[PDB]
Every structure is written in structure tokens, then in C-alpha cells.
Amino acid sequence: ALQYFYFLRNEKDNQGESMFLRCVSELVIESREFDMLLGKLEKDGSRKPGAIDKFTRDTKTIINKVASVAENKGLFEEAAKLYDLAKNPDKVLELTNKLLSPVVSQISAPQSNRERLKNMALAIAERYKSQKSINSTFYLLLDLITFFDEYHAGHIDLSFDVIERLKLVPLSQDSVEERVAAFRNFSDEIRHNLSEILLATMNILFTQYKRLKGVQEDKDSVLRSQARALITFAGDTNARLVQMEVLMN
Amino acid sequence: QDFKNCFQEYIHNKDRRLSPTTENKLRLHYRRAVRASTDPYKRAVYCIIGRCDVSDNHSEVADK
Amino acid sequence: ARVVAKLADMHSPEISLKQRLEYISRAADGEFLHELEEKLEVARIQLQIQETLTRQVGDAVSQLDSQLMDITKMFGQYADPFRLSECKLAIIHCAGHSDPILVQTLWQDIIDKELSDSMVDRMQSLHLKITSLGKIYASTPRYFPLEFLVKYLEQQVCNFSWDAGFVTYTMQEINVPVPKLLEVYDHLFKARDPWWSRMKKPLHLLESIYILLSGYVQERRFTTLCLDAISCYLVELQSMDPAPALLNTVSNFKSLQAKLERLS
Amino acid sequence: DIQGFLKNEKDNALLSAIEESRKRTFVMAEEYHRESMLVEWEQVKQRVLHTLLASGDNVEMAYARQMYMYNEKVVSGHLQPSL
Amino acid sequence: LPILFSALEVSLRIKQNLHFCEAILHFLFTLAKTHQGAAAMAGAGITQTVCLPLLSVYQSWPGVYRLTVSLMERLLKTLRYNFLSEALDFVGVHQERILQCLSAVRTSLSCLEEADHTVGFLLQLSNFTKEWHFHLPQLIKDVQVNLCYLCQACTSLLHSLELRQLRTVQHSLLKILGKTLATLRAFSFGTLLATVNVTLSMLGEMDKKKESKNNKSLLLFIMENCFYLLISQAVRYLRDPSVHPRDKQRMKQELSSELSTLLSSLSRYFRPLIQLVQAFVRHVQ
Incomplete structure (x- = not known):
């Protein structure tokens, strides 16, 4: 069909657009075959050509509008890849964060796209880090993805270490002040991860608390102490920490 | 047979957790799907685990 | 819970502040929670005062350690005598008292005393203390007069001729939102305070705005307000007599204007 | 106690103002959705009626290979062959 | 919003402070016109709070229920994609009451308003009829x-x-x-x-x-x-x-x-x- 539609290469509608682009868009959106006609984005961020690349030199606006359509269709991942092709890191990071958000929880290790999404996020992060506001939001979102991964995986020691090094989440009552600063200074794609980052750091503290408790009462004391200190750091946190002190008692 | 730590939490493991939500999710699905299930034993087990549907004698599997 | 609370509350030389805090962490209900939270705030204040006294006096430390102190006693017997400006700011913040010029003086005292305690290093010490206090009081508008802090600190930076960005980076270090800071800066500019004219630095306000806005761009409606304020200050500076500083500020703000336009 | 009368009056005034603004917004939503249903309905109707007046392979593959060859000599700017 | 929803949950549990419930509901609905507003509203688990107790009211009150349904419909209209899940959840909960409202129009102004609200909610949901029939085939x-x-x-x-x-x-x-x-x-x-x-x-x-x-x-x-x-x-x-x-x-x-x-x-x-x-x-x- 695209071989036929190439024949309208020079056609202009009454409004001046190229019939080639309109037909290619309707086909790719209809035939679920954008990957062939307009191309596919590899892992490194280089554009594998589409057939519609043969008839014209540039398909930037095509990529943008088609990514918009996929967005409208709720097609998150392909919209990310498409905007990625169109050289729009902003929308890319946007969709990446939007999807990575629910990726806080891990189960059915290989079956769930957890592995798939992890790989795609890793590749996109590598792409942007190779490619201050946008890049910092990006790389911090990537480290936040790593933190959520170790949280959902049971990797506890190394991720708590990296958390300590990052100074994004406060682990001490006085670090309340510190916490505000970090949470106030960072960029968008990081603050978007800030909520789940808080949740995961709290639960890591919590499992360390339980392993200590599971000398006992002293462990429960240190646990609730860390809980209330993190509470002072972050409303929601204080209710959560009071609740945890309640439940462990 | 995240659901394994949950199962142990239900039977044996103490599972002290911080800001976690428990027994809200179980009763929810149970009311949604299990409450109408054609498996008497299954619905009875759901009642037992999630402390819900106390009205049901579930006498299909409880006779004495 | 009641028992550990009582032990935390027992005025005794054996129950130090640390064990007090731990017993607290191990500790009709809603008012009890609010009481305990206000207690925790007063406690952070007390520990700040004690630590500063220990590093910067024996009886005051021993007394603040011996029993819980109420706000008035800390203010009059502890915070004021040692002139702990940041401490008084935190205290009146916890007391919900609002006194504008007093808050001005508290921020100014923080700034000047810090600038003293490190006799570049002076402005750095000012950044240190002003941030240390702001992050404590920026949340209680009754004890952190953002306008007054910015005004007095700009006066100081004009006095010692430091980098005009110290005020902006400092205030941002206390998480004061860039828009309210833009409002403070624009208002200070509109008041046409003859002081800045007296120091022959009539564009210091403009350069501060420029640093704030360029920092903002590097890191649509806020940008719109920025476009409006940039046009306004451009008109005000184009109305002033042409000095080299004036024209340099003019071209810099114009560059910021076109940059924000590309950013909008 | 004219004060309490005044205050309850102002409060009920706010409540009625909000309830009325709410009902107005709801009616606006309903009517806008209605005009939307009408427009999209006419669009479905026209596509449909065009399907209605519609009721009273190897060859295409060869034609498609030919058209591909033609547009291919077109894009490369080659001498436009006779289709 | 945290303390607020905690309160509302308590209130609906005990079935008290009807004026409080209604006023808070109206405030919420007004906040819901905003994108960020409704975004946080969901981020509060407004569903997680309200959906459970709301059974109690049927097991001013009907006014509060209506305002809640209105907020749900507006929330769907504000953020359909990411909110359809919770919307469907609440509907599966409130399904019987929605049916009762749609049926009461036969036998009363209150029945009228309840039917109108249930219908508006159904309309707001109709824009995702695909997933609607997908999850709840009997429902659609x-x-x-x-x-x-x-x-x-x-x-x-x-x-x-x-x-x-x-x-x-x-x-x-x-x-x-x-x-x-x-x-x-x-x-x-x-x-x-x-x-x-x-x-x-x-x-x-x-x-x-x-x-x-x-x-x-x-x-x-x-x-x-x-x-x-x-x-x-x-x-x-x-x-x-x-x-x-x-x-x-x-x-x-x-x-x-x-x-x-x-x-x-x-x-x-x-x-x-x-x-x-x-x-x-x-x-x-």
C-alpha cells in the first residue's frame, strides 16, 4: 500500500499538504505497522528507516503528530519511542516517568514487563546521558528507577548506601531541613519520582527494622525512632510512621 | 502456588510493615469476584482469610 | 505510651535530651497528637539553643538540659541574652507571633553576626546563617519576613560589595519559591528606595533580578510574569539617566527578555 | 439575635450560590456533550449512508509491483517512465 | 487532604456531620475543576477513602452522595485514562445504587436528581466504552x-x-x-x-x-x-x-x-x- 502511495509523492491537497504524508499516517495508524513505514527506534536511539523515508527526506512533524496519536490512544511506550525518534527528550522523559511510576512493585519476575520496562528505561537513560534542568531530572529519574528496582527486588544494602550518597531522601530528623532543600531544588523528572522514592526508602528502613526485631525492644525503639525522624523530615509521613509503630507493637 | 511474603504474613510470618495496607485488598477482590464464586471451599477460605462475609454460614463446606 | 511520655517529661539530671527524644519516639487522641507535635517543635528549638550554646554558658546548657522550657523562658532568659537571632525567629515562629520589623531585625542580625563570625568568607558566612534560619522559619510567615530579609541583605551586599547573586542563591537555598522572590525583588525595585541611589548602585535590584531570572531559565505563566516584570524594569531603567551600569543592566535584561521569550 | 440570623443567611446564600453554579455547570456539561453527540452522530451517519448507497489478487499484485517501480523511478528523479 | 479524608472516612463510618460531609464534598468538587487539583485528589486515594464507607449511607446525605458522584464524573472528564480503573472500581461498588437511581425516575424530585447524577456519571464513563465493556461485560x-x-x-x-x-x-x-x-x-x-x-x-x-x-x-x-x-x-x-x-x-x-x-x-x-x-x-x- 505504501508502494502505491509513493505514487502520490508530489500531490498537494487543496490546503497544500502532501497526500503522501496523510495516506502514510492513516495507514501506519490503522495497520499497526508504523514500525515498517516510518521506521523503528533502536535501543541506542538511532532511527531504523521506514519505507516513507525513501520518498521524502524529513519526517519530523510526521513523527510528532503520530506520537501524539499514540498518546491519544494511550499507547505510552510507542509514543515514547516515537517522540524519541523526533528528537523531543521532554515528552520522552515525561512518558518514561509516567510509566515507571507504577513499576514500584515487582512480582512474576520475567512474566511481567518489569524486565522489559527496566531494559527500556535503562536504554533511554543511557541515551539521554550520552546525548542542566532536563538532564538532571532525567538522570535523577534513572537513579530513582534504580532505587525503586532494588526496593521491589529485595536489594537493600547497596540501594540504601546509594540513597545515603544521593542526599535526596532524609534518614534523620535533623535532615528534615536537608530534605526540604533537596526536594525543593531538584528538577521535574526527579520530583515526579520523589513520591515513590520516599515510599521505598521508608519501607527499606522498615524491613531493616523487622530483620533487627525478628536486644529486641531496643530494636523496636531504634525502628520507631528512624520512623519518626523520617516523619519530621518529609503529614503523610507522620501518619505512616505512627501507624508502623502501632502495627509492630 | 510479592504474593509469597503476603501469604506467609497471612499464616505464619509476623510481617510488621510500615505504611502498608492489609486486608483491605483481599476483602475487596473477594466481594468483587470470590463472593460469587462457584467454589464453596474457595469462598469459605476467602471469608476466613480476610475477615469478611461473616453472614455466610458457607454451610456447603461447614456442616457440623 | 503514657509511661514513656512521663519518663520523657521527668525533670531529672539522669534523663538527658537524647533519652528524652528516644522515649518520645517510643511514645480524645487527636489533641494528644497535636500536643506532642507542638512539643516536638519546641524540642527542636531547645536542642538548637543547647547545641549553639555548647559550641559558642554552663548553667544555661545545664538548665535547658535539666527540664522542659516554655517559649517565654527560652525567649527572655535563653534566646535573647545570647542574642541567638535564628533561635528567636524559630521561637516566635512556634509562638505564631507576627512582628514585621522585629522579623526584619532577626534576619538582619543573623546576616551580620554570621558575616562577623567568619571575619568572600563573610558573605559565605551570611549565606550559612541566613539559610540555617530560613529553612527553619520560611514556613511560618509570622517569623520570616522574606521581604525584610531580602531588603536588609541587599543593603549588606551593597555595603561590602559582594556578588549581587548571594541574596537570590541564599533565599533559594531556603526553598523560598522563585515567584514570591520575584515579587519581593520587583516590589523593592518599585519602592524606588533612595538608599540604593545613595550607594551609587541604582541597578543592584536589576542585577539581582537578572541573576534570579537567568538561574530560573537555566533550571509559561511564571515566565509570563517574568516577561511583564522585565518589560517594566526595562521601562524604569530606560527612564533613568544613562550611566554605564544603567545601559549594561539594560542590555543584560534585554538578553534575559529574549531568552525567556525562547523559553516561553 | 439579629447576628445569628445574618450569619445563617450569608451561609445559606453561599450554599445556594454554589449549588446553582454547580447545576449550571452540570447543564452546560450535558448540553455541550449533546452538541458533541450531534456532531459525531452526523459524522457516523454520513459514513454510514455512504456505506448504504454502496448497497443498491494476482492482478493487483502485478499492478502494485508496477506502481512501486514507477514511484521508485520518480523519487530517485530518474526519467519518468511511461506508466 | 490527608486529615480531611481521614475525617470523612470516620464520619461516614459513624454517619455524622452531614453538613460537614456535604461542605467538604462541595469544596472537593470545586477543587476538582483543576488538573493538578484532581490529580492530587486521586493521589490522596479519594477513592480508597470514600468508596468503602459510601455503602453505609444507603445500606444532606443523598445530596452528599450526588455531589460525590458529580466529583467522580468531573474527575473522569478531567483525567479519563489514568482514572478509569478507580472509576470502574467505584462503579462496581455503587452499581446497585446507580441502577436504583436510574429506575426511581418512574415513581419525586430526589429520584430525578439521583437519576440525573447517575446518568451523568454513566456519560462520563461512556467515553471509555471499550474498557468499560472489557472489564464489566454484563454492566455495559x-x-x-x-x-x-x-x-x-x-x-x-x-x-x-x-x-x-x-x-x-x-x-x-x-x-x-x-x-x-x-x-x-x-x-x-x-x-x-x-x-x-x-x-x-x-x-x-x-x-x-x-x-x-x-x-x-x-x-x-x-x-x-x-x-x-x-x-x-x-x-x-x-x-x-x-x-x-x-x-x-x-x-x-x-x-x-x-x-x-x-x-x-x-x-x-x-x-x-x-x-x-x-x-x-x-x-x-
């Missing part, structure tokens, strides 16, 4: 069925100072009816023709009786929608090769008759819709 179907039933009920009630109160009640009934009509539309041929006929009948009955302009707009929308739906169904039967040509031509003739008569009576009342209807009749003739 029983919904379409009862919606036809209730649109017919509204038509029947409408076609046939106490005068002022009655006129106001009928005006609200007609507004809700037009809403439900455009709704079932947004979702035999003789039944469609009956709908269009009742539409023209209500239009004549209203234009005779000289809030009301609302009835006029709703009935006009309903006429447009019934035309579109009947036409789409007939064009389906026509383009469908499984429908025999005998049924094709027979339906063509019968529909041409009914449509000529209806378009004639229409042009009589109204003295591009008339053009479209005449063209559909001719292409069906």
Missing part, C-alpha cells in the same frame, strides 16, 4: 438496555403555582431526558422510529404549551441523535453482505415510507438536517 449491556428503557420512560412521562411546580419538574425531567437520549445515542429499526416519533411528539407538545428552552434544545439534540442512530443501523444492514438483498430492499422501502412521512411532518413543524433526512429517504426509496 444491562446499561444500554435499561437506558433505552429509561429514555422511553422519560418520553412517556413528558408527552402526557402547582402548575409552576409541575412545569419545573417537567423541565428538569426533559433536561435529564435529553441527556439520557444523547447518552444512549453516544452508545429494531421500528424502535428507533418510535424514539424519533416520540421526539417529534414531545417537540410539538412543548411548542404547544405556550427551563423550557432547555427542553427545546434537548429534544432537538434527541431528534438529531435518533436520526443518526437509525441511519447508522440501517446503513449497517445495507452494507452487511450477510443481510439478504430481500431484507435490504424491503427495509429500504419501509424506511423510505416512514422517513418520507416523518420528514414531511418535520418540515411541517419547523416551518442541513432536513436535507440529510430527505437524502436518506431517497437513497432508501
Whole structure:
């Protein structure tokens, strides 16, 4: 069909657009075959050509509008890849964060796209880090993805270490002040991860608390102490920490 | 047979957790799907685990 | 819970502040929670005062350690005598008292005393203390007069001729939102305070705005307000007599204007 | 106690103002959705009626290979062959 | 919002502070007009809080329920994609009460408002009919069925100072009816023709009786929608090769008759819709 539609290469509608682009868009959106006609984005961020690349030199606006359509269709991942092709890191990071958000929880290790999404996020992060506001939001979102991964995986020691090094989440009552600063200074794609980052750091503290408790009462004391200190750091946190002190008692 | 730590939490493991939500999710699905299930034993087990549907004698599997 | 609370509350030389805090962490209900939270705030204040006294006096430390102190006693017997400006700011913040010029003086005292305690290093010490206090009081508008802090600190930076960005980076270090800071800066500019004219630095306000806005761009409606304020200050500076500083500020703000336009 | 009368009056005034603004917004939503249903309905109707007046392979593959060859000599700017 | 929802949960649990519940609900609904507002509202688990207790109220109060449904509909209209899940959850919970509201319109102003709110919620959900039928297949179907039933009920009630109160009640009934009509539309041929006929009948009955302009707009929308739906169904039967040509031509003739008569009576009342209807009749003739 695209071989036929190439024949309208020079056609202009009454409004001046190229019939080639309109037909290619309707086909790719209809035939679920954008990957062939307009191309596919590899892992490194280089554009594998589409057939519609043969008839014209540039398909930037095509990529943008088609990514918009996929967005409208709720097609998150392909919209990310498409905007990625169109050289729009902003929308890319946007969709990446939007999807990575629910990726806080891990189960059915290989079956769930957890592995798939992890790989795609890793590749996109590598792409942007190779490619201050946008890049910092990006790389911090990537480290936040790593933190959520170790949280959902049971990797506890190394991720708590990296958390300590990052100074994004406060682990001490006085670090309340510190916490505000970090949470106030960072960029968008990081603050978007800030909520789940808080949740995961709290639960890591919590499992360390339980392993200590599971000398006992002293462990429960240190646990609730860390809980209330993190509470002072972050409303929601204080209710959560009071609740945890309640439940462990 | 995240659901394994949950199962142990239900039977044996103490599972002290911080800001976690428990027994809200179980009763929810149970009311949604299990409450109408054609498996008497299954619905009875759901009642037992999630402390819900106390009205049901579930006498299909409880006779004495 | 009641028992550990009582032990935390027992005025005794054996129950130090640390064990007090731990017993607290191990500790009709809603008012009890609010009481305990206000207690925790007063406690952070007390520990700040004690630590500063220990590093910067024996009886005051021993007394603040011996029993819980109420706000008035800390203010009059502890915070004021040692002139702990940041401490008084935190205290009146916890007391919900609002006194504008007093808050001005508290921020100014923080700034000047810090600038003293490190006799570049002076402005750095000012950044240190002003941030240390702001992050404590920026949340209680009754004890952190953002306008007054910015005004007095700009006066100081004009006095010692430091980098005009110290005020902006400092205030941002206390998480004061860039828009309210833009409002403070624009208002200070509109008041046409003859002081800045007296120091022959009539564009210091403009350069501060420029640093704030360029920092903002590097890191649509806020940008719109920025476009409006940039046009306004451009008109005000184009109305002033042409000095080299004036024209340099003019071209810099114009560059910021076109940059924000590309950013909008 | 004219004060309490005044205050309850102002409060009920706010409540009625909000309830009325709410009902107005709801009616606006309903009517806008209605005009939307009408427009999209006419669009479905026209596509449909065009399907209605519609009721009273190897060859295409060869034609498609030919058209591909033609547009291919077109894009490369080659001498436009006779289709 | 944390403390607020904690409070509301407590309140609905004990069934107290009705004025508090309603005021908070209105404040929430007002905040919900904003994108960030409703975003955080969900981020508060407003569903996680309200959905559970709301069973208690039916197991001012109905006003609070209505305001909650309104907030749900507005929230769907504000953020459909990421919120459809919770919306469907709450609906599966509140399904029985929504059905009761949609049924009470037969036997009362409170029943009217409740039906209107349930219908508005159903409308806000209709924009995701795909996932709707996907998860709750019985739901969307029983919904379409009862919606036809209730649109017919509204038509029947409408076609046939106490005068002022009655006129106001009928005006609200007609507004809700037009809403439900455009709704079932947004979702035999003789039944469609009956709908269009009742539409023209209500239009004549209203234009005779000289809030009301609302009835006029709703009935006009309903006429447009019934035309579109009947036409789409007939064009389906026509383009469908499984429908025999005998049924094709027979339906063509019968529909041409009914449509000529209806378009004639229409042009009589109204003295591009008339053009479209005449063209559909001719292409069906």
C-alpha cells in the first residue's frame, strides 16, 4: 500500500499538504505497522528507516503528530519511542516517568514487563546521558528507577548506601531541613519520582527494622525512632510512621 | 502456588510493615469476584482469610 | 505510651535530651497528637539553643538540659541574652507571633553576626546563617519576613560589595519559591528606595533580578510574569539617566527578555 | 439575635450560590456533550449512508509491483517512465 | 487532604456531620475543576477513602452522595485514562445504587436528581466504552438496555403555582431526558422510529404549551441523535453482505415510507438536517 502511495509523492491537497504524508499516517495508524513505514527506534536511539523515508527526506512533524496519536490512544511506550525518534527528550522523559511510576512493585519476575520496562528505561537513560534542568531530572529519574528496582527486588544494602550518597531522601530528623532543600531544588523528572522514592526508602528502613526485631525492644525503639525522624523530615509521613509503630507493637 | 511474603504474613510470618495496607485488598477482590464464586471451599477460605462475609454460614463446606 | 511520655517529661539530671527524644519516639487522641507535635517543635528549638550554646554558658546548657522550657523562658532568659537571632525567629515562629520589623531585625542580625563570625568568607558566612534560619522559619510567615530579609541583605551586599547573586542563591537555598522572590525583588525595585541611589548602585535590584531570572531559565505563566516584570524594569531603567551600569543592566535584561521569550 | 440570623443567611446564600453554579455547570456539561453527540452522530451517519448507497489478487499484485517501480523511478528523479 | 479524608472516612463510618460531609464534598468538587487539583485528589486515594464507607449511607446525605458522584464524573472528564480503573472500581461498588437511581425516575424530585447524577456519571464513563465493556461485560449491556428503557420512560412521562411546580419538574425531567437520549445515542429499526416519533411528539407538545428552552434544545439534540442512530443501523444492514438483498430492499422501502412521512411532518413543524433526512429517504426509496 505504501508502494502505491509513493505514487502520490508530489500531490498537494487543496490546503497544500502532501497526500503522501496523510495516506502514510492513516495507514501506519490503522495497520499497526508504523514500525515498517516510518521506521523503528533502536535501543541506542538511532532511527531504523521506514519505507516513507525513501520518498521524502524529513519526517519530523510526521513523527510528532503520530506520537501524539499514540498518546491519544494511550499507547505510552510507542509514543515514547516515537517522540524519541523526533528528537523531543521532554515528552520522552515525561512518558518514561509516567510509566515507571507504577513499576514500584515487582512480582512474576520475567512474566511481567518489569524486565522489559527496566531494559527500556535503562536504554533511554543511557541515551539521554550520552546525548542542566532536563538532564538532571532525567538522570535523577534513572537513579530513582534504580532505587525503586532494588526496593521491589529485595536489594537493600547497596540501594540504601546509594540513597545515603544521593542526599535526596532524609534518614534523620535533623535532615528534615536537608530534605526540604533537596526536594525543593531538584528538577521535574526527579520530583515526579520523589513520591515513590520516599515510599521505598521508608519501607527499606522498615524491613531493616523487622530483620533487627525478628536486644529486641531496643530494636523496636531504634525502628520507631528512624520512623519518626523520617516523619519530621518529609503529614503523610507522620501518619505512616505512627501507624508502623502501632502495627509492630 | 510479592504474593509469597503476603501469604506467609497471612499464616505464619509476623510481617510488621510500615505504611502498608492489609486486608483491605483481599476483602475487596473477594466481594468483587470470590463472593460469587462457584467454589464453596474457595469462598469459605476467602471469608476466613480476610475477615469478611461473616453472614455466610458457607454451610456447603461447614456442616457440623 | 503514657509511661514513656512521663519518663520523657521527668525533670531529672539522669534523663538527658537524647533519652528524652528516644522515649518520645517510643511514645480524645487527636489533641494528644497535636500536643506532642507542638512539643516536638519546641524540642527542636531547645536542642538548637543547647547545641549553639555548647559550641559558642554552663548553667544555661545545664538548665535547658535539666527540664522542659516554655517559649517565654527560652525567649527572655535563653534566646535573647545570647542574642541567638535564628533561635528567636524559630521561637516566635512556634509562638505564631507576627512582628514585621522585629522579623526584619532577626534576619538582619543573623546576616551580620554570621558575616562577623567568619571575619568572600563573610558573605559565605551570611549565606550559612541566613539559610540555617530560613529553612527553619520560611514556613511560618509570622517569623520570616522574606521581604525584610531580602531588603536588609541587599543593603549588606551593597555595603561590602559582594556578588549581587548571594541574596537570590541564599533565599533559594531556603526553598523560598522563585515567584514570591520575584515579587519581593520587583516590589523593592518599585519602592524606588533612595538608599540604593545613595550607594551609587541604582541597578543592584536589576542585577539581582537578572541573576534570579537567568538561574530560573537555566533550571509559561511564571515566565509570563517574568516577561511583564522585565518589560517594566526595562521601562524604569530606560527612564533613568544613562550611566554605564544603567545601559549594561539594560542590555543584560534585554538578553534575559529574549531568552525567556525562547523559553516561553 | 439579629447576628445569628445574618450569619445563617450569608451561609445559606453561599450554599445556594454554589449549588446553582454547580447545576449550571452540570447543564452546560450535558448540553455541550449533546452538541458533541450531534456532531459525531452526523459524522457516523454520513459514513454510514455512504456505506448504504454502496448497497443498491494476482492482478493487483502485478499492478502494485508496477506502481512501486514507477514511484521508485520518480523519487530517485530518474526519467519518468511511461506508466 | 490527608486529615480531611481521614475525617470523612470516620464520619461516614459513624454517619455524622452531614453538613460537614456535604461542605467538604462541595469544596472537593470545586477543587476538582483543576488538573493538578484532581490529580492530587486521586493521589490522596479519594477513592480508597470514600468508596468503602459510601455503602453505609444507603445500606444532606443523598445530596452528599450526588455531589460525590458529580466529583467522580468531573474527575473522569478531567483525567479519563489514568482514572478509569478507580472509576470502574467505584462503579462496581455503587452499581446497585446507580441502577436504583436510574429506575426511581418512574415513581419525586430526589429520584430525578439521583437519576440525573447517575446518568451523568454513566456519560462520563461512556467515553471509555471499550474498557468499560472489557472489564464489566454484563454492566455495559444491562446499561444500554435499561437506558433505552429509561429514555422511553422519560418520553412517556413528558408527552402526557402547582402548575409552576409541575412545569419545573417537567423541565428538569426533559433536561435529564435529553441527556439520557444523547447518552444512549453516544452508545429494531421500528424502535428507533418510535424514539424519533416520540421526539417529534414531545417537540410539538412543548411548542404547544405556550427551563423550557432547555427542553427545546434537548429534544432537538434527541431528534438529531435518533436520526443518526437509525441511519447508522440501517446503513449497517445495507452494507452487511450477510443481510439478504430481500431484507435490504424491503427495509429500504419501509424506511423510505416512514422517513418520507416523518420528514414531511418535520418540515411541517419547523416551518442541513432536513436535507440529510430527505437524502436518506431517497437513497432508501
